[PDB]
Short mmCIF file of C-alpha atoms and ligand atoms in Angstrom, two decimals:
data_model
loop_
_atom_site.label_atom_id
_atom_site.label_comp_id
_atom_site.label_asym_id
_atom_site.label_seq_id
_atom_site.Cartn_x
_atom_site.Cartn_y
_atom_site.Cartn_z
CA UNK A 1 105.37 92.73 126.58
CA UNK A 2 104.65 96.24 125.40
CA UNK A 3 108.34 97.11 125.58
CA UNK A 4 109.33 94.27 123.32
CA UNK A 5 106.68 95.47 120.88
CA UNK A 6 107.81 99.09 121.15
CA UNK A 7 111.39 98.05 120.54
CA UNK A 8 110.31 96.36 117.38
CA UNK A 9 108.68 99.50 116.11
CA UNK A 10 111.68 101.59 117.15
CA UNK A 11 113.82 99.38 114.99
CA UNK A 12 111.71 100.15 111.92
CA UNK A 13 112.83 103.70 112.04
CA UNK A 14 115.28 104.48 109.24
CA UNK A 15 114.50 101.52 107.10
CA UNK A 16 112.79 103.89 104.72
CA UNK A 17 110.62 100.88 103.97
CA UNK A 18 106.89 100.54 104.38
CA UNK A 19 105.32 98.32 106.97
CA UNK A 20 102.17 97.32 105.22
CA UNK A 21 100.51 98.39 102.77
CA UNK A 22 102.40 101.51 103.83
CA UNK A 23 99.66 103.48 105.56
CA UNK A 24 99.46 104.77 109.12
CA UNK A 25 97.14 102.05 110.31
CA UNK A 26 99.40 99.28 109.05
CA UNK A 27 101.95 100.28 111.65
CA UNK A 28 99.30 100.39 114.36
CA UNK A 29 97.92 97.06 113.20
CA UNK A 30 101.35 95.41 113.37
CA UNK A 31 102.08 96.83 116.78
CA UNK A 32 98.75 95.73 118.19
CA UNK A 33 99.26 92.23 116.91
CA UNK A 34 102.57 92.06 118.73
CA UNK A 35 100.78 92.72 121.95
CA UNK A 36 97.65 90.70 121.20
CA UNK A 37 98.80 87.98 118.80
CA UNK A 38 95.87 85.73 119.65
CA UNK A 39 92.99 88.24 119.47
CA UNK A 40 90.05 87.22 117.29
CA UNK A 41 88.47 90.64 117.06
CA UNK A 42 90.22 93.98 116.55
CA UNK A 43 92.57 95.96 114.30
CA UNK A 44 95.38 93.45 114.33
CA UNK A 45 92.84 90.67 114.10
CA UNK A 46 91.49 92.36 111.00
CA UNK A 47 87.99 92.23 112.40
CA UNK A 48 85.95 95.19 113.57
CA UNK A 49 82.38 96.44 113.82
CA UNK A 50 80.73 97.21 110.51
CA UNK A 51 78.72 99.73 112.53
CA UNK A 52 81.03 102.45 111.29
CA UNK A 53 83.11 101.62 109.24
CA UNK A 54 81.62 103.18 106.18
CA UNK A 55 82.22 102.04 102.62
CA UNK A 56 84.24 99.20 104.10
CA UNK A 57 87.20 101.45 104.80
CA UNK A 58 89.17 101.82 107.99
CA UNK A 59 89.32 105.58 108.77
CA UNK A 60 92.04 106.38 111.32
CA UNK A 61 89.95 108.92 113.17
CA UNK A 62 87.49 106.20 114.20
CA UNK A 63 89.83 103.36 115.07
CA UNK A 64 89.18 103.78 118.75
CA UNK A 65 85.48 103.28 118.20
CA UNK A 66 85.45 100.85 115.27
CA UNK A 67 87.34 98.06 116.91
CA UNK A 68 86.63 96.16 120.06
CA UNK A 69 89.81 97.13 121.88
CA UNK A 70 88.31 96.32 125.27
CA UNK A 71 87.77 92.71 124.22
CA UNK A 72 91.49 92.20 124.17
CA UNK A 73 92.33 94.14 127.30
CA UNK A 74 92.96 97.58 125.87
CA UNK A 75 91.31 100.62 127.37
CA UNK A 76 89.99 103.40 125.19
CA UNK A 77 89.54 107.02 126.26
CA UNK A 78 89.08 110.55 124.96
CA UNK A 79 91.08 111.79 127.93
CA UNK A 80 94.81 111.54 128.57
CA UNK A 81 97.40 111.76 129.80
CA UNK A 82 99.80 110.48 127.16
CA UNK A 83 101.92 107.55 128.19
CA UNK A 84 104.38 105.28 126.45
CA UNK A 85 102.80 102.48 124.50
CA UNK A 86 99.49 104.04 123.66
CA UNK A 87 97.98 104.01 120.23
CA UNK A 88 96.56 107.47 119.55
CA UNK A 89 94.10 108.65 116.95
CA UNK A 90 93.75 112.12 115.56
CA UNK A 91 91.00 114.04 113.86
CA UNK A 92 90.60 114.94 110.21
CA UNK A 93 92.66 117.70 108.70
CA UNK A 94 93.05 119.70 105.54
CA UNK A 95 92.93 117.09 102.78
CA UNK A 96 92.75 114.16 105.19
CA UNK A 97 89.13 113.23 105.93
CA UNK A 98 90.15 110.00 107.65
CA UNK A 99 92.61 111.63 110.01
CA UNK A 100 95.73 109.89 111.32
CA UNK A 101 96.92 107.26 113.83
CA UNK A 102 100.25 106.96 115.68
CA UNK A 103 102.15 105.26 118.51
CA UNK A 104 103.50 106.92 121.61
CA UNK A 105 107.01 105.73 122.20
CA UNK A 106 107.89 108.03 125.06
CA UNK A 107 106.81 110.86 127.31
CA UNK A 108 109.54 113.18 128.60
CA UNK A 109 108.24 116.39 130.11
CA UNK A 110 106.05 117.94 127.46
CA UNK A 111 107.84 116.17 124.70
CA UNK A 112 105.96 113.42 122.97
CA UNK A 113 108.04 110.93 121.07
CA UNK A 114 105.80 109.64 118.30
CA UNK A 115 106.31 106.66 116.01
CA UNK A 116 104.20 106.97 112.85
CA UNK A 117 103.86 105.95 109.20
CA UNK A 118 102.52 107.92 106.24
CA UNK A 119 102.89 111.27 107.89
CA UNK A 120 103.83 113.43 104.93
CA UNK A 121 103.33 111.39 102.91
CA UNK A 122 106.35 109.31 103.76
CA UNK A 123 104.88 105.87 103.55
CA UNK A 124 107.37 104.44 106.01
CA UNK A 125 107.94 104.61 109.77
CA UNK A 126 109.27 107.87 111.15
CA UNK A 127 110.08 109.14 114.60
CA UNK A 128 108.83 112.63 115.36
CA UNK A 129 108.51 114.92 118.33
CA UNK A 130 105.54 117.00 119.38
CA UNK A 131 104.34 119.03 122.35
CA UNK A 132 101.77 117.28 124.51
CA UNK A 133 99.88 120.49 125.17
CA UNK A 134 99.58 121.08 121.45
CA UNK A 135 99.08 117.46 120.40
CA UNK A 136 96.20 116.71 122.76
CA UNK A 137 94.08 119.29 120.92
CA UNK A 138 93.79 116.88 117.98
CA UNK A 139 93.54 113.57 119.82
CA UNK A 140 90.35 111.62 119.35
CA UNK A 141 91.19 108.57 121.48
CA UNK A 142 93.91 107.40 123.80
CA UNK A 143 94.20 103.63 123.40
CA UNK A 144 96.08 101.98 126.21
CA UNK A 145 97.40 98.41 126.02
CA UNK A 146 97.15 95.91 128.86
CA UNK A 147 106.38 82.27 118.79
CA UNK A 148 108.87 81.77 115.95
CA UNK A 149 109.46 79.34 113.07
CA UNK A 150 112.98 78.28 112.07
CA UNK A 151 114.96 76.58 109.31
CA UNK A 152 118.30 76.11 107.67
CA UNK A 153 118.98 77.92 104.42
CA UNK A 154 122.38 78.70 103.00
CA UNK A 155 121.77 81.91 101.12
CA UNK A 156 123.21 85.35 100.58
CA UNK A 157 121.57 88.61 101.50
CA UNK A 158 122.34 91.81 99.68
CA UNK A 159 121.38 94.87 101.74
CA UNK A 160 118.97 97.33 100.10
CA UNK A 161 118.47 99.83 102.91
CA UNK A 162 120.94 102.36 104.29
CA UNK A 163 122.03 100.03 107.10
CA UNK A 164 120.94 97.07 109.24
CA UNK A 165 122.15 96.32 112.74
CA UNK A 166 123.98 93.07 113.50
CA UNK A 167 122.77 91.53 116.74
CA UNK A 168 123.72 88.78 119.17
CA UNK A 169 120.06 87.85 119.58
CA UNK A 170 117.04 87.82 117.27
CA UNK A 171 115.18 90.42 119.21
CA UNK A 172 115.53 94.15 119.11
CA UNK A 173 117.43 94.57 122.35
CA UNK A 174 123.16 94.84 121.92
CA UNK A 175 124.47 95.88 118.53
CA UNK A 176 127.68 94.25 117.36
CA UNK A 177 127.95 96.21 114.15
CA UNK A 178 126.03 97.19 111.04
CA UNK A 179 125.78 96.28 107.37
CA UNK A 180 125.48 99.10 104.85
CA UNK A 181 123.51 99.32 101.60
CA UNK A 182 124.88 97.13 98.83
CA UNK A 183 126.93 94.88 101.10
CA UNK A 184 126.53 91.11 101.02
CA UNK A 185 126.84 88.24 103.47
CA UNK A 186 125.98 84.57 103.86
CA UNK A 187 123.67 82.98 106.38
CA UNK A 188 122.77 79.42 107.28
CA UNK A 189 119.58 79.96 109.23
CA UNK A 190 116.25 81.73 108.96
CA UNK A 191 113.95 82.74 111.83
CA UNK A 192 110.40 83.88 111.10
CA UNK A 193 108.76 85.60 114.06
CA UNK A 194 105.02 85.16 113.97
CA UNK A 195 104.79 88.79 114.85
CA UNK A 196 108.09 90.62 114.60
CA UNK A 197 110.87 90.25 112.06
CA UNK A 198 112.41 87.81 109.64
CA UNK A 199 115.96 87.27 110.85
CA UNK A 200 118.80 85.64 109.02
CA UNK A 201 121.53 84.19 111.18
CA UNK A 202 125.11 83.03 110.86
CA UNK A 203 128.27 82.21 112.82
CA UNK A 204 130.52 85.25 113.04
CA UNK A 205 134.28 85.34 113.32
CA UNK A 206 134.42 85.17 117.11
CA UNK A 207 132.61 81.83 116.94
CA UNK A 208 129.20 83.06 117.94
CA UNK A 209 125.85 83.57 116.21
CA UNK A 210 125.08 86.97 114.83
CA UNK A 211 121.53 87.89 113.91
CA UNK A 212 120.22 90.28 111.30
CA UNK A 213 116.66 91.57 110.93
CA UNK A 214 115.44 91.72 107.35
CA UNK A 215 111.83 92.94 107.41
CA UNK A 216 108.59 92.86 109.37
CA UNK A 217 106.28 89.90 109.81
CA UNK A 218 102.63 89.80 110.79
CA UNK A 219 100.76 86.60 111.49
CA UNK A 220 103.77 84.59 110.35
CA UNK A 221 104.01 86.21 106.92
CA UNK A 222 106.10 89.13 105.72
CA UNK A 223 104.24 92.39 106.30
CA UNK A 224 106.10 94.91 104.25
CA UNK A 225 109.05 94.81 101.93
CA UNK A 226 112.33 93.08 102.69
CA UNK A 227 115.43 95.00 103.66
CA UNK A 228 117.41 93.24 100.96
CA UNK A 229 117.52 90.66 98.19
CA UNK A 230 118.30 87.00 98.61
CA UNK A 231 120.25 84.60 96.41
C1 58B B 1 121.75 100.67 111.22
C2 58B B 1 120.70 101.76 111.32
N1 58B B 1 121.17 102.76 112.22
C3 58B B 1 119.41 101.15 111.82
O1 58B B 1 118.90 101.48 112.87
N2 58B B 1 118.79 100.15 111.02
C4 58B B 1 117.58 99.54 111.41
C5 58B B 1 117.83 98.09 111.80
C6 58B B 1 118.03 97.91 113.30
C7 58B B 1 117.53 96.57 113.80
O2 58B B 1 116.75 95.92 113.08
O3 58B B 1 117.86 96.09 114.91
C8 58B B 1 116.66 99.63 110.22
N3 58B B 1 117.06 99.20 108.93
O4 58B B 1 115.56 100.10 110.37
CL1 CL B 2 78.32 96.00 113.67
CL1 CL B 3 83.55 92.10 118.56
#
């Protein structure tokens, strides 16, 4: 679903680690793919119209028009309203000819909750808040949306981000505890989501499997740096 995909983006917040590539569209791309993993055309699919598209570059301001969103069930519009789950493009600004692209996480009153990457710069996912009434003045398009591979490995992960949540399931929805930067722990299992996260897993004290996310995947490969080192 769209919620499962949104949850996966929410959980990127605070990694301080780039999804991608590291640019704004890499986050959009990854999110789209989570919703349309099997699309053949589109942003996540890596295939769009060369029609424009100029110089073989992406250009965030044109993403709504440069990819065949409709082919995969997405609607595209220059009119709102905002709603959770949309991908939203924004016009060019001072020193940014290509503009910007973001993800709407939530709509509460006039508050937009926006997930985005390379706003700053700050080449990693950030949550920010904006006013709808003010934000809509820069919106180009509103883009509205409609397994896993596993093995044993007995390794040790050393955390290289501020903290990672410990979960009872390898999806991003009940947090047992966290691991902080520098800490270490052993695992016996690896799970590679085709479109999601790499998880390592182990048996905790209580007798039950804990799960730990360790970085984003796209199309079954890592899609950004890892949240730690492995030995
Ligand atoms: C622990 C910290 N508050 C946090 O939110 N970390 C997330 C991981 C949460 C998760 O993957 O479920 C991260 N490194 O982005
Ligand atoms: Cl074309
Ligand atoms: Cl097409």
